[PDB]
Design an enzyme around this catalytic site. Structure first.
Site, mmCIF file in Angstrom:
data_model
loop_
_atom_site.group_PDB
_atom_site.id
_atom_site.type_symbol
_atom_site.label_atom_id
_atom_site.label_comp_id
_atom_site.label_asym_id
_atom_site.label_seq_id
_atom_site.Cartn_x
_atom_site.Cartn_y
_atom_site.Cartn_z
ATOM 1 N N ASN B 154 7.940 9.816 -0.456
ATOM 2 C CA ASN B 154 7.005 10.245 0.580
ATOM 3 C C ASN B 154 7.531 9.986 1.987
ATOM 4 O O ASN B 154 7.154 10.705 2.919
ATOM 5 C CB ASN B 154 5.657 9.547 0.398
ATOM 6 C CG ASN B 154 5.775 8.038 0.427
ATOM 7 O OD1 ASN B 154 6.627 7.459 -0.247
ATOM 8 N ND2 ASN B 154 4.922 7.391 1.213
ATOM 9 N N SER B 202 -1.604 14.578 -6.556
ATOM 10 C CA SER B 202 -2.812 14.532 -5.744
ATOM 11 C C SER B 202 -2.996 15.871 -5.043
ATOM 12 O O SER B 202 -2.016 16.520 -4.661
ATOM 13 C CB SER B 202 -2.741 13.399 -4.720
ATOM 14 O OG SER B 202 -4.021 13.108 -4.190
ATOM 15 N N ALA B 203 -4.255 16.277 -4.869
ATOM 16 C CA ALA B 203 -4.533 17.644 -4.443
ATOM 17 C C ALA B 203 -4.309 17.844 -2.951
ATOM 18 O O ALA B 203 -3.825 18.904 -2.536
ATOM 19 C CB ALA B 203 -5.964 18.026 -4.805
ATOM 20 N N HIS B 204 -4.661 16.855 -2.127
ATOM 21 C CA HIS B 204 -4.644 17.061 -0.683
ATOM 22 C C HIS B 204 -3.232 17.117 -0.105
ATOM 23 O O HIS B 204 -3.085 17.123 1.123
ATOM 24 C CB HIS B 204 -5.452 15.971 0.029
ATOM 25 C CG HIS B 204 -4.913 14.590 -0.164
ATOM 26 N ND1 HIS B 204 -4.377 13.852 0.869
ATOM 27 C CD2 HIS B 204 -4.808 13.820 -1.272
ATOM 28 C CE1 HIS B 204 -3.977 12.680 0.408
ATOM 29 N NE2 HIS B 204 -4.223 12.636 -0.889
ATOM 30 N N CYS B 327 16.506 1.893 6.682
ATOM 31 C CA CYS B 327 17.765 1.144 6.706
ATOM 32 C C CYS B 327 17.594 -0.390 6.757
ATOM 33 O O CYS B 327 17.497 -1.023 5.673
ATOM 34 C CB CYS B 327 18.616 1.634 7.882
ATOM 35 S SG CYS B 327 19.490 3.136 7.338
HETATM 36 C C1 LIG Z 1 3.909 9.861 -3.785
HETATM 37 C C2 LIG Z 1 2.434 9.520 -3.548
HETATM 38 N N1 LIG Z 1 1.655 9.135 -4.601
HETATM 39 C C3 LIG Z 1 0.324 8.824 -4.395
HETATM 40 C C4 LIG Z 1 -0.207 8.902 -3.124
HETATM 41 C C5 LIG Z 1 -1.693 8.564 -2.877
HETATM 42 O O1 LIG Z 1 -2.468 9.718 -3.275
HETATM 43 P P1 LIG Z 1 -4.128 9.499 -3.352
HETATM 44 O O2 LIG Z 1 -4.583 8.899 -2.027
HETATM 45 O O3 LIG Z 1 -4.834 10.864 -3.613
HETATM 46 O O4 LIG Z 1 -4.454 8.512 -4.484
HETATM 47 C C6 LIG Z 1 0.560 9.290 -2.066
HETATM 48 C C7 LIG Z 1 -0.079 9.358 -0.658
HETATM 49 N N2 LIG Z 1 0.999 9.247 0.385
HETATM 50 C C8 LIG Z 1 0.423 9.035 1.744
HETATM 51 C C9 LIG Z 1 -0.674 7.968 1.717
HETATM 52 C C10 LIG Z 1 1.539 8.631 2.680
HETATM 53 O O5 LIG Z 1 2.651 8.447 2.233
HETATM 54 O O6 LIG Z 1 1.327 8.490 3.892
HETATM 55 C C11 LIG Z 1 1.892 9.602 -2.267
HETATM 56 O O7 LIG Z 1 2.724 10.012 -1.128
#
Ligand SMILES: Cc1ncc(COP(=O)(O)O)c(CN[C@@H](C)C(=O)O)c1O
Ligand SMILES: Cc1ncc(COP(=O)(O)O)c(CN[C@@H](C)C(=O)O)c1O
Ligand SMILES: [Cl-]
Ligand SMILES: [Cl-]
Lengths: 366, 366
Positions: B154, B202-204, B327
């Site tokens: 992420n 995750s959907a959003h 890093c």
């Molecule tokens: C790889 C990954 N898995 C799971 C989640 C959490 O998803 P839910 O909130 O629907 O459970 C995130 C959220 N990331 C955001 C928070 C970020 O990296 O800023 C994610 O990047």
């Protein structure tokens, strides 16, 4: 077509003010509240007003937590399993006492806990239809970790001797949890009067969206999280906040409590109208007590007609109600559960269609 | 005001077609799908089309399950704890191998499992920025219950040697799970190519609503439910279905995969435009590999300026991006993550505002 919804104990219609208040967070204000920029911070006011509507809705204190969950089922699983890891495993108290009328979200999870070696006493239901409050008193051993009793039953609408059981649980110093899903919107709910350490509720039963719920946790009560990640909700339930559903569930709570007097003075009166009009016909008797019931639900049995049959014929005339196991074989009865949107006209037509169906299926039984 | 959203790895905007397809299930079609009357059955078609959009979105088979959860965090907790009760406790395999870059939903839950006495090897990250796939090979003992590796990170956007790790997990006969939240919408996802037994998303993150997610379970793989009650989703996850969010998440999946070619040919090109325009300035270097990255994310470090500072000054000009540890000290870097709605004009203005800020805060540092 004009259809009549009398199954509000399965789910309720989203109030227009709720869909209204939710729309902007599905539209332009989509930021993640965990973000630091204006898209995240921009969402914090409406979130805070929502949570305050919840706290004030159940008379929770600012010292307590009202954690936002996915549904009442998540709340119940989190309570049972949390107090399992907390008390049963790490304090020996390998005993949990509850009723046999609890939602499968409770009974099934306790069944899992028995699978883990937990002793559970499922309190038997009486003929009046509710628990005595003294059943838990004679039930609480010295190794009971928790008492779980629903505030009101989903099938019968019968309120339970909460507040009393809360006082008993305070006396013997044991954790108290109540599945209050069917109580919100129907009758006032006070966590302080109930001496409840844990309270569950689901949103779509007081005209909010499905797929969001809430768990109240009294100040100082620890509950090992079901959702780990520890970023959201004081770390107790991780996952990005369902901003829209949170806002709309706050408004659904507010509107729900602002219609309590309407719920008893009006909705309960339509319940008495329909029910009393219905037991004027041959062999039909309401299941359980009639005095201490939520204003909106009645569960009646019929002659030699299964519940699903009357559900089918009622469905064919576009009237929606559920079933509900009743007395003895089971036999299944009819559950009709009103809401603040139903009118008297719908009730009259439900008595017409009901009687027509009763003599229809009743005659065809020969 | 014209603001520019470059934090789509925190959350994404709900696509208008998604809010469109969701509206009726917040309005007139509010029935509980578990009900038997026309209000429940009335909802089943749209639900089935949604789930089929999901299956076809990740190339899942009709034999497999794609269980609908509250979020990716619930999916991860359910995987880790489920395979804990299933394999670690009741098959001895008291070992789980994962990476150090996993979302806190994974790392924190594994930390809880260590609290329960589970041995966990958090695979170290290399200088290239990803895992080798051979790290798991040298890591898989004979008592490893599960390997968990995110499909893409992420913070950095770095894709991971999945499919390879899937083949390794098939060879040694061990469970494979992948947090694929950042992969959906960005790059194609194939559960069959990945030999994955469990997949989270995750959907959003592909322009659906917050507060719904999904967990893919291969046919024959058992996972003790996190939500007990056993009525919904083949009993594996109880709770009334979030009908609207389910439908909209199906459409979000569909639209997400129908824009994959657009995501790489267009969105990735705007990423290269912004990023390349940004490293033309003094002391700034992208964190991690640049070749195997999702098309939409770049994570760059700056001189002697903390990430939060550039976040603040960028926020003041109404441009939204996140941070990302980078890093060594950490020092925190800037994460800019694009979407299919951003334009080139927004990119040019982000380079303008970015450079102005860089020399601003950089000069004020003296
Ligand atoms: C790889 C990954 N898995 C799971 C989640 C959490 O998803 P839910 O909130 O629907 O459970 C995130 C959220 N990331 C955001 C928070 C970020 O990296 O800023 C994610 O990047
Ligand atoms: C007392 C109670 N608790 C919990 C639930 C389940 O809520 P969630 O689906 O949001 O987890 C219900 C639903 N009842 C419905 C199903 C009925 O009785 O027909 C309930 O009546
Ligand atoms: Cl737990
Ligand atoms: Cl579990």
């Amino acid at each position: 077509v004009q259809r009549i919804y009398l199954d509000n104990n399965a789910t309720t219609r989203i109030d227009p003010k709720v869909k209204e208040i939710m729309d902007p967070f599905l539209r332009d204000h989509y930021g993640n509240p965990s973000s630091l920029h204006q898209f995240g911070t921009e969402t914090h006011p409406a979130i805070a007003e929502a949570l305050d509507k919840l706290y004030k809705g159940i008379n929770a204190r600012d010292i307590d937590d009202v954690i936002i969950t996915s549904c009442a089922t998540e709340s119940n699983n989190w309570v049972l399993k949390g107090v399992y890891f907390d008390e049963c495993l790490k304090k020996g108290k390998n005993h949990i006492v509850t009723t046999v009328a609890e939602h499968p979200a409770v009974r099934s999870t306790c069944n899992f806990l028995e699978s883990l070696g937990v002793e559970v006493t499922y309190l038997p239901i009486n003929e009046h239809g509710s628990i005595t409050a003294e059943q838990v008193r004679e039930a609480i051993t010295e190794k009971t970790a928790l008492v779980s009793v629903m505030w009101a039953n989903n099938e019968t609408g019968l309120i339970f001797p909460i507040e009393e059981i809360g006082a008993i649980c305070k006396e013997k110093g044991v954790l108290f949890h109540t599945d209050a899903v069917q109580a919100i919107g129907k009758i006032p709910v006070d966590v302080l009067k109930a001496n409840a350490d844990f309270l569950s509720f689901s949103a779509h039963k007081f005209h909010g969206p499905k797929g969001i719920g809430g768990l109240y946790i009294r100040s100082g009560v620890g509950l090992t999280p079901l959702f780990h990640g520890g970023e959201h909700m004081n770390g107790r339930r991780s996952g990005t906040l369902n901003v829209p559903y949170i806002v709309g569930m706050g408004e659904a709570m507010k509107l729900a409590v602002e219609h309590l007097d309407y719920e008893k003075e009006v909705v309960g009166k339509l319940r008495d109208k329909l029910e009393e009009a219905l037991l004027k016909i041959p062999d039909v008797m309401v299941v359980g007590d009639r005095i201490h019931r939520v204003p909106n639900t009645t569960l009646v049995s019929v002659r030699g007609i299964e519940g699903e049959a009357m559900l089918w014929d009622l469905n064919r005339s576009n009237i929606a109600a559920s079933t509900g196991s009743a007395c003895a074989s089971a036999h299944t009865a009819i559950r009709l559960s009103l809401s603040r949107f139903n009118t008297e006209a719908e009730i009259d037509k439900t008595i017409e269609v009901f009687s027509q169906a009763a003599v229809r299926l009743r005659n065809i039984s020969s």
